[PDB]
Structure 1
Amino acid sequence: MQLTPFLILLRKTLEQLQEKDTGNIFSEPVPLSEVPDYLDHIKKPMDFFTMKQNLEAYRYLNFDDFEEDFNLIVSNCLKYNAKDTIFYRAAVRLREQGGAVLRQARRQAEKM
Structure 2
Amino acid sequence: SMEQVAMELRLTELTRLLRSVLDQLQDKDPARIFAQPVSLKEVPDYLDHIKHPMDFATMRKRLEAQGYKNLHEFEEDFDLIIDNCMKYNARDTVFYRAAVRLRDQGGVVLRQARREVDSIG
Q: TM-score, normalised by structure 1?
A: 0.96
CA contact (8 A) 2:11 2:66 kept: no
Name which of 30, 38, 42 aligns with 1:30: 38
**1:75-103 Cα distance to aligned partner (Å, 9 max, x none):** 00000001110000101111100111111
After the TM superposition, which residues 89-100 of structure 1 pair with which residues of structure 2 at under 5 Å, given as runs? 89-100=97-108
Gaps of 5+ in 1: none
Aligned to 1:88: 96
Quote the Cα distance in structure 2 between the aligned partners of 1:56 and 1:22: 22
Aligned to 1:67: 75
Gaps of 5+ in 2: 1-6
Equivalent residue letter for 1:29: P
Q: TM-score, normalised by structure 2?
A: 0.89
- Which aligned segments of 4 or more residues in structure 1 are displaced greater than 2 angstroms? none
Quote the Cα distance in structure 1 between the aligned partners of 2:101 and 2:61: 24
Equivalent residue letter for 1:4: T
1:5 positional shift: 1.6
Identity of aligned residues (%): 64
**Number of residue equivalences:** 112
